[PDB]
């Protein structure tokens, strides 16, 4: 079973940048995308975007576009999330998740079946 | 932005109870619905995809149904480890907005 | 400003020598007695199907491309240090090109160096066909600045570059520092009958579609037509619009369910359904793309939505891949 | 783009490593006796049961949307088993192929865009969704796949034959020129039989051969020496017999 | 072509309204 292992919690001051990692274990990015999900303290889930490493294609929600960057390494199967211009509202748990994009998986409808443990990033 | 509403917002139940959670989209989105269960301090787990297909590795007590805009997840026999939050997710268009969640308390 | 083209803009269409013969050819030529735009700061010009250029060493080089913004490859011809340079790099261009133009030289896929060319006019023809950028030119003396010379002169070819870039617009380049002047016409797929003399140089030509007399000259493969009655072509009035008339029938065909049926029969007992008297929207079938094999025989697959059949029998079954 | 070489296709062909060598408009073994203006070499990797589609007049996902050969193709298509090099343990998902496009490719067209394919009316805001498909899909190459699905490297050599100067010629050694004799000549791929004489036709520096009204070459420029040879057919005529009886 | 470059056009069996014009039983001259 392919599992995602994320980096540990990070505390950073506003205005700095944060780098979260997400490593595949027991598998590789075999026709799968890496999506990022956000979760404020005591709040629900927030979808931000996803990366297709194979082509280095990255898509992000309008809200975050500009200060948010997702990159991926297909050879080692490791993705990293780099966020700049940190503000206090950026404190949240970030999850990486295996998703679909290929037409052949149409019956899955872009669901996410394996989730990492999450990385808490605290801005203060 | 697709408006997606969960119901009920919260519910209390005991082990053995029958649970039914409804998820409605503000417009037709066919079968682009995924179901997740999430425990405090842990990531969600995918339970039901394609509105009706049972996900591999999910206990058979969970089941999905529904048609058009309204789709429902049913828990036949609530278990101690079933006390958790339940999320529906639409994938019709970007962004793939998540609901505010439904908290299940003992 | 506009000028008249008269009988200029003819180039050796096939590069095979002929002598003392009247040869009929179909190619991109500048139609005779057409109006050519006269420019006298430089504008952006469309390239379309080919360009005829004339000028009268102020004007050096030309720029061709599609977007002219370093996003796509762009043909550049420059006359520097007596050795002409042609490159197809994604240069980032200025608003008014004049050395600045050659910056950001990356993603270069072709480079060429050749020998230099250019009271005398300098005629050029640029044609882009099937990935070949063909450039023809000749220099000729003039003593009349009010118009473009009357006469006939065939344009000797110079080179042919296998660039293969989709070119849509072009611009001329001035010497970097009341201006100079140039004439540009647009080429059209007209049929020309060319006279090759004993030595092999085109001395006259006739446009097969310019005028009825030229139509006879072309059809008779001769430059002099004796008195008489001659047939050259056929008048046929063209249709003005398309009209579709179909029965009022609005019934939808079962196709939807047949593909999406949950339980399929075994291959030994293939299921047959007869389908008639219903409109069938094959565009929903197509844009519902999840098929791994779609092969049609005796009809084009892309044009199943434009015919009408007596009846469709639908057979269905399940098999293994191989 | 390959040009200005002595293309030795005879060495290349007789290697048993190649699994498919199919030439159209040229016989695979006579290629060494012809000269070509410019040869384009295309290369890519596809699955086994799709090599059959890399042929003129063919249809299917790769032929329609990836690589389309013209109806009158003159050249060769070469393919061989890459299963050892390209396929990696645990599946090789690195090679992608396009399934969707607004229209079918014109012959030899290349489309490397990655925009989402809008198959319906609803616009796709840069993320796949309903009626919004990602245009590419990856090959599932695995060492346990049947041969029909194993990967195949494909190289397509396209040969052009226009009224233009030849540069790539099979490595047939050049010979001396004999004038005023009936000989069977081969001038850079132009073959024929006739008597070669001097000519006074002043070809322009760009012309290579001259043509007659009929489907025959009347003059030619010899390579190496650029001289102009007139070719007149060898004398012939009918024979009649006079017999008293 | 040895006498004049002037030409006349006859549209055979095509009564002319469709684009001096003289109608003859042979067509429109
Ligand atoms: C052809 O060239 C020769 C000399 O090169 C010249 O005498 C002759 O007049 C030329 N023919 C024509 C039609 O000008």
DSSP per-residue letters across D100-118: --SSPPPTT--------EE
Tell me whether strands B62-67 and B53-54 are parallel, antiparallel or unpaired. unpaired
The β-bridge partners of C312 are C275
User: What token pair was written down for D102?
Assistant: 């607004």
Tokens 């797929």 sit on residue: C189
Do B6 and B102 meet the contact criterion of CB atoms below 8 Å apart?
Answer: yes
Domain of C49: which CATH number?
2.60.120.960
Residue C100 DSSP SS3: helix
Backbone angles phi, psi at A89, to 5 degrees: -70, 0
Alpha helices in C19-125 (DSSP H): none
As a whole number of Å, the CA-based R_g of chain D is 26
Residue D187 and residue D165: Cα distance in Å, rounded?
11
Alpha carbons within 13 A on the beta-carbon side of D148? 3
Residue C16 and residue D201: Cα distance in Å, rounded?
13
Counted domains in chain C: 1
Do D37 and D5 meet the contact criterion of CB atoms below 8 Å apart?
Answer: no
Do D71 and D57 meet the contact criterion of CB atoms below 8 Å apart?
Answer: yes
Residue B23 and residue B87: Cα distance in Å, rounded?
9
Residue A92 and residue A122: Cα distance in Å, rounded?
7
What is the experimental resolution, given in Å to one decimal place?
Answer: 3.3
Atom of ligand 1 nearest to the CA of C203: 13
Residue A49 DSSP SS3: strand
Name the minimum distance, in Å, from the CA of B92 to any CA of chain D.
5
Q: Look at residue C294 and tell me if it is in a domain.
A: no
Residue A89 DSSP SS3: helix
Q: State the structure-solving technique.
A: cryo-EM
Tell me whether strands A119-123 and B4-7 are parallel, antiparallel or unpaired. unpaired
Do C101 and C91 meet the contact criterion of CB atoms below 8 Å apart?
Answer: yes
Q: Look at residue C123 and tell me if it is in a domain.
A: yes
Q: Which of C39, C8, C13 is nearest to C25 (CA)?
A: C13
Per this entry, what is the length of chain A?
124
Q: For C17, which of D59, D148, D210 is closest by C-beta distance?
A: D210
Q: Dihedral through CA C27, CA C29, CA C33, CA C35, nearest 10?
A: 130
User: What token pair was written down for D129?
Assistant: 């969704």
As a whole number of Å, the CA-based R_g of chain B is 13
Residue D9 DSSP SS3: helix
How much distance in Å is there from the Cα of C151 to the middle of ligand 1? 19
- The DSSP string of chain B is ---EEEE-SEEE--TT--EEEEEEESS--TT-EEEEEE-TTS--EEEEETTTEEPTT--TTEEEEEETTEEEEEESS--GGG-SEEEEEE-SSSS-PBP---EEE-
Residue D175 and residue D198: Cα distance in Å, rounded?
18
Do C123 and C53 meet the contact criterion of CB atoms below 8 Å apart?
Answer: yes
Q: Chains with ≥3 Cβ pairs under 8 A against E?
A: C
The β-bridge partners of D193 are D184
Is the preceding omega at residue A118 within 30 degrees of 0, hence cis? Answer: no
- Sign of CA pseudo-dihedral C308, C313, C318, C322: negative
Phi/psi region, residue A15 (left: phi>0; alpha: psi -120 to 50; beta: rest), is left
Alpha carbons within 13 A on the beta-carbon side of A17? 10
Atom of ligand 1 nearest to the CA of D202: 5
Q: Which of C18, C132, C14, C122 is nearest to C61 (CA)?
A: C122
Taking an 8 Å cut-off on Cβ atoms, the answer to whether D164 and C160 are in contact is: yes
Residue of D nearest to A102 (CA): D137
Burial class (CB in 10 A: 0-12, 13-18, 19+), C206: buried
Q: Which of C223, C215, C213 is nearest to C191 (CA)?
A: C215
Residue D163 DSSP SS3: coil
Q: How far, in whole angstroms, is CA D200 from its chain's centroid?
A: 36
Residues 6+ apart with CB under 8 A from A66: none
Domain of B35: which CATH number?
2.60.40.10
List the domain boundaries for chain A. Answer: 3-123
Counted domains in chain B: 1
Taking an 8 Å cut-off on Cβ atoms, the answer to whether A54 and D93 are in contact is: yes
Residue D217 and residue D232: Cα distance in Å, rounded?
9
Backbone angles phi, psi at C127, to 5 degrees: -135, 130
Residue D114 and residue D95: Cα distance in Å, rounded?
14
Long-range CB contacts (within 8 A, 24+) of D160-165? D160/D36, D160/D37, D160/D38, D160/D39, D160/D40, D160/D74, D161/D36, D161/D37, D161/D74, D162/D37, D163/C14, D163/C15, D163/C16, D164/C15, D164/C160, D164/D37, D164/D208, D165/D37, D165/D208
Tell me whether strands A10-12 and A119-123 are parallel, antiparallel or unpaired. parallel
Q: Which of D131, A68, D99 is nearest to C294 (CA)?
A: D99
Do A36 and A48 meet the contact criterion of CB atoms below 8 Å apart?
Answer: yes
How much distance in Å is there from the Cα of C159 to the middle of ligand 1? 26
Alpha helices in chain D (DSSP H): 9-13, 61-65
Residue D185 and residue D214: Cα distance in Å, rounded?
19
Query: Residue B76 sits in which domain range?
Result: 4-104
Rounded alpha-carbon distances, angstroms, from residue C249 to C182, C245, C255, C280, C304: 62, 12, 16, 11, 19
Do B45 and A117 meet the contact criterion of CB atoms below 8 Å apart?
Answer: no
Residue whose Cα lies nearest atom 1 of ligand 1: it is C199
Do D158 and D39 meet the contact criterion of CB atoms below 8 Å apart?
Answer: yes
Task: Spell D216-242 as b/e; 16+ CB within 10 A means b.
Answer: ebbbbbbeeeeebbbbeeeeeeeeeee
Taking an 8 Å cut-off on Cβ atoms, the answer to whether A61 and B94 are in contact is: yes
The β-bridge partners of A24 are A4
Do B67 and B30 meet the contact criterion of CB atoms below 8 Å apart?
Answer: no
Long-range CB contacts (within 8 A, 24+) of C294-300? C295/D59, C295/D60
Residue D139 DSSP SS3: coil
Do C63 and C167 meet the contact criterion of CB atoms below 8 Å apart?
Answer: no
Do D161 and D36 meet the contact criterion of CB atoms below 8 Å apart?
Answer: yes
Phi/psi region, residue A56 (left: phi>0; alpha: psi -120 to 50; beta: rest), is left
Residue of D nearest to C15 (CA): D207
Q: Look at residue C227 and tell me if it is in a domain.
A: yes
Tokens 């065909």 sit on residue: C253
Provide residues with CB under 6 Å of ligand 1: C 197-199
Superfamily of domain A3-123: Immunoglobulins (2.60.40.10)
């Amino acid at each position: 079973q392919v599992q995602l292992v994320q980096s540990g919690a990070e505390v950073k001051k506003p205005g700095s940048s944060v780098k979260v990692s997400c490593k595949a274990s027991g598998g590789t990015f075999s026709n799968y995308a890496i999506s990022w999900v956000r979760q404020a303290p005591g709040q629900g889930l927030e979808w931000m975007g996803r990366i297709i490493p194979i082509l280095g294609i990255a898509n992000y929600a309008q809200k975050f576009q500009g200060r948010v960057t997702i990159t991926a390494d297909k050879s080692t199967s490791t993705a990293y999330m780099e966020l700049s211009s940190l503000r206090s509202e950026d404190t949240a748990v970030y999850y990486c998740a295996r998703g679909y994009y290929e037409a052949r998986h149409y019956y899955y409808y872009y669901a996410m079946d394996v989730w990492g443990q999450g990385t808490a990033v605290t801005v203060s | 932005d697709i408006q997606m509403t969960q119901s009920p917002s919260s519910l209390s139940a005991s082990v053995g109870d029958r649970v039914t959670i409804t998820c409605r989209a503000s417009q037709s989105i066919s079968s682009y619905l995924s179901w997740y269960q999430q425990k405090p301090g842990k990531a969600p787990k995918l339970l039901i995809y394609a509105a009706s297909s049972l996900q591999s590795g999910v206990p058979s007590r969970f089941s999905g149904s529904g048609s058009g805009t309204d789709f429902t997840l049913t828990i036949t026999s609530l278990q101690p480890e079933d006390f958790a939050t339940y999320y529906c997710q639409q994938s019709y268009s970007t962004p793939r907005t998540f609901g505010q969640g439904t908290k299940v308390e003992i | 400003a506009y000028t008249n083209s008269f009988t200029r803009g003819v180039y050796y269409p096939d590069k095979v020598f002929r002598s003392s013969v009247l040869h009929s050819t179909q190619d991109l030529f500048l139609p005779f007695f057409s109006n050519v735009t006269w420019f006298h700061d430089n504008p952006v010009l469309p390239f379309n199907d080919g360009v005829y250029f004339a000028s009268t060493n102020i004007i050096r080089g030309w720029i061709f491309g599609t977007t002219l913004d370093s996003k796509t490859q762009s043909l550049l011809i420059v006359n520097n240090a007596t050795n002409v340079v042609i490159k197809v790099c994604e240069f980032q261009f200025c608003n008014d090109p004049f050395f600045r133009v050659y910056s950001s030289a990356n993603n270069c896929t072709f480079e060429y160096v050749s020998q230099p060319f250019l009271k005398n006019l300098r005629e050029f023809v640029f044609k882009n066909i099937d990935g070949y950028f063909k450039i023809y030119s000749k220099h000729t003396p003039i003593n009349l600045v009010r118009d473009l010379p009357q006469g006939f002169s065939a344009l000797e070819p110079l080179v042919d570059l296998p660039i293969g870039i989709n070119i849509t617009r072009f611009q001329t380049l001035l010497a970097l520092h009341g201006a100079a002047a140039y004439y540009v016409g647009y080429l059209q797929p007209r049929t020309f009958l060319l006279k090759y003399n004993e030595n092999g140089t085109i001395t006259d030509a006739v446009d097969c579609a310019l005028d009825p007399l030229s139509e006879t000259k072309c059809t008779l493969k001769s430059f002099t037509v004796e008195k008489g009655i001659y047939q050259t072509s056929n008048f046929r009035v063209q249709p003005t619009e398309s009209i579709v008339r179909f029965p009022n029938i609005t019934n939808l065909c079962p196709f939807g369910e047949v593909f999406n049926a949950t339980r399929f029969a075994s291959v030994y007992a293939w299921n047959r359904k007869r389908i008639s008297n219903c409109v069938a929207d094959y565009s929903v079938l197509y844009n519902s793309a999840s098929f791994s094999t779609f092969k049609c025989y005796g009809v084009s697959p892309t044009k199943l939505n434009d015919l009408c059949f007596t009846n469709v029998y639908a057979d269905s079954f399940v098999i293994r891949g191989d | 783009r390959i040009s200005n070489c002595v293309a030795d296709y005879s060495v290349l062909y007789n290697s048993a490593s190649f699994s498919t060598f199919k030439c159209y408009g040229v016989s695979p073994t006579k290629l060494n006796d012809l000269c070509f203006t410019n040869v384009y070499a295309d290369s890519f990797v596809i699955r086994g049961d799709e090599v059959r589609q890399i042929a003129p007049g063919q249809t299917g996902k790769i032929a329609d949307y990836n690589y389309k050969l013209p109806d009158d193709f003159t050249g060769c298509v070469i393919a061989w088993n890459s299963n050892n090099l390209d396929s990696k343990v645990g599946g090789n998902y690195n090679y992608l192929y396009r399934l969707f496009r607004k229209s079918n490719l014109k012959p030899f067209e290349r489309d490397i865009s990655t925009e989402i394919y809008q198959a319906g009316s609803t616009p796709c805001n840069g993320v796949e969704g309903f009626n919004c498909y990602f245009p590419l899909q990856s090959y599932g190459f695995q060492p346990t796949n049947g041969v029909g699905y194993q990967p195949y490297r494909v190289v397509v050599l396209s040969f052009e034959l226009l009224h233009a100067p030849a540069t790539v010629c099979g490595p047939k050694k050049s010979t001396n020129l004999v004038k005023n004799k009936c000989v069977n000549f081969n001038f850079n791929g132009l073959t024929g039989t006739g008597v070669l004489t001097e000519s006074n036709k002043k070809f322009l520096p760009f012309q290579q051969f001259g043509r007659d009204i009929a489907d025959t070459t009347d003059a030619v420029r010899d390579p190496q020496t650029l001289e102009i040879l007139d070719i007149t057919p060898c004398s012939f005529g009918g024979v009649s017999v006079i017999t008293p009886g | 072509t040895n006498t004049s470059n002037q030409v006349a056009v006859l549209y055979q069996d095509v009564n002319c309204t469709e684009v001096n014009v003289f109608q003859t039983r042979a067509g429109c001259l």
